[PDB]
A paper describes a structure:
Bemnifosbuvir (AT-527) and AT-752 are guanosine analogues currently in clinical trials against several RNA viruses. Here, we show that these drugs require a minimal set of 5 cellular enzymes for activation to their common 5′-triphosphate AT-9010, with an obligate order of reactions. Crystal structures of human histidine triad nucleotide binding protein 1, adenosine deaminase-like protein 1, guanylate kinase 1, and nucleoside diphosphate kinase at 2.09, 2.44, 1.76, and 1.9 Å resolution, respectively, with cognate precursors of AT-9010 illuminate the activation pathway from the orally available bemnifosbuvir to AT-9010, pointing to key drug–protein contacts along the activation pathway.
GUK1 is a nucleoside monophosphate kinase able to transfer a phosphate group from ATP to a guanosine 5′-monophosphate, yielding GDP and ADP. GUK1 exhibits the highest turnover in the activation chain, but the 2′-C-methyl, 2′-F modification slows it down approximately 200-fold. GUK1 was crystallized and its structure solved at 1.76 Å resolution in complex with AT-8001. The structure presented here is an open conformation, with the AT-8001 substrate binding through extensive contact with both the phosphate moiety and the nucleobase. Thus, on the one hand, Tyr 81, Tyr 53, and Arg 41 share hydrogen bonding with the oxygen of the phosphate, while Arg 44 makes a contact through a water molecule. On the other hand, Glu 72 and Ser 37 engage hydrogen bonds with the base, while Tyr 53 contributes to positioning the base through π-stacking.
Residue numbers in the entry:
A (entry chain A): 1 to 195
B (entry chain B): 2 to 194
The structure:
Amino acid sequence: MSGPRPVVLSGPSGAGKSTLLKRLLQEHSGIFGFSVSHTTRNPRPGEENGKDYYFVTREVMQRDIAAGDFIEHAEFSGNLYGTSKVAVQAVQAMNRICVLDVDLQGVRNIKATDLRPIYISVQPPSLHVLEQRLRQRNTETEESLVKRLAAAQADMESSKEPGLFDVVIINDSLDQAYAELKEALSEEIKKAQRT
Amino acid sequence: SGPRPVVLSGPSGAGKSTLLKRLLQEHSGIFGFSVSHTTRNPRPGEENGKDYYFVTREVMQRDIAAGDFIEHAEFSGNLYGTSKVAVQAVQAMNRICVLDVDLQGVRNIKATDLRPIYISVQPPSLHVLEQRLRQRNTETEESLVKRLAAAQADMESSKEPGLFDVVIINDSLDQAYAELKEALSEEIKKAQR
Ligand SMILES: C[C@@]1(F)[C@H](O)[C@@H](COP(=O)(O)O)O[C@H]1n1cnc2c(=O)[nH]c(N)nc21
Ligand SMILES: C[C@@]1(F)[C@H](O)[C@@H](COP(=O)(O)O)O[C@H]1n1cnc2c(=O)[nH]c(N)nc21
C-alpha cells in the first residue's frame, strides 16, 4: 500500500479537466496510471479481462459493491462501471499516481471510503464561458446544452463546499491552470519520479 | 507502423463531428489529429507546425500533384489539406489519427497508400436528419433544402459496396458512440499498449 497518493480530478465536463489530464500524461510518461475498472458491459474485440476492464456480471458487481470493495461506481449506457480499492492499490504498487477522473457523485462516493487521495476540481471561469466553449463545439442541441449546463452549475456550486476539494483550479487559461495542477501534484510527482 | 487512422464521414450534422469531438475528449493517449497545411497567411498566435503548416499556393499545388496530400479543399480563396506526413506523424506516436471529411475527402483518401478504417455516420432517415438540422442550425429553408440534397447524395453513396468498413446509424449519440468505440476496439488496444 506504499506509493504515490491517488488524485481525484473532477469539475464540470468540458471545463478543462480532460485537456489538463492529457497534458499531464504527455509530459510525465510513467508517473500516472489508470486503475483497471470493473464493468458489466460485454468486452469488445481486442479488450482483455484484467487489463482493459474486469468484465463481471451485474450480480457480481452488486455483491462486491455491497461487500465494500468499491471506492465509486455508476451506471453508463445501460451498464455498471466502477473502481475497486484493489485496482487503485494495484496502480499504487507500480509507484504510479492513480488518476480518478470522476464527476461530483464520484467525488462524494470516494469521500465515503478510507482512501486518502488529493481532491482537485477544474472549474470554468463562469457558466457563460462553459456555455460558449460548448456552443463553439457544435456537439449540443439547445435541450442537451441546457441539461449539461444545469449539471455543470450544480458541480460549480458544490465545488465551494469547505473541505470538499484540496485544490480548486479556475481555468482562465490552459497554461495557467496546468501550472496550478502541476504545482498541486509536485510532491507526489517527485515521489513517483525518484523511486 | 502504428494504429490505423480512422476516416469519419457521413452527412454534415448527422453526428460524425460530435462523435469525433467526444472520442478525443474522453480518451487519453489514444487519439490524435493531424496538423493541416494552408496557403492562407498565418494570423496572430498561430505557429507553423502547430496550428497549420503555412506554405505558398505554388508549393501546395506542386505537393498535391506529387501525391503528398491525402485530401484537400479550397476555402475562401485559400487551399487547406492534410498531408500524408502529418497523418504518419500521429501514427508514429502510436496514436489513432482521426480524419473528419466529406464524401469527396473519403474518395481522395481511398486513392492514397494509407490504410485507414472508413466509417460513415448516417442519420436514421433523411426526415430525421431534417428535424435534427431544423432544431439546431439557424438556417433558411433554401439553405436547409441545399443541405438535405447534399445529405441524400451522401446517404445514397454510403451504401456503395466496399466504400465504408462500418456504417453506423446515429439513432442516438450515445448508441452511435458505443458502436464507434466497438468498431475501433482493435486499434484502441494497439494505442493503449
Ligand atoms: C469513464 C466513463 F464515463 C466512460 O466514458 C463510460 C463508457 O466506457 P466504455 O464502455 O469503456 O466506452 O463509462 C464510464 N466509466 C468507465 N469506467 C468507469 C469507472 O471505473 N467508474 C465510473 N464512475 N465510470 C466509469
Ligand atoms: C475546416 C475548414 F473548413 C476551416 O473551417 C476552414 C477555414 O480555416 P481557418 O481559416 O483556419 O478558419 O478551412 C477548412 N480546413 C482547414 N483545414 C483543412 C484541412 O486540412 N482540410 C480541409 N478539407 N479543410 C480544411
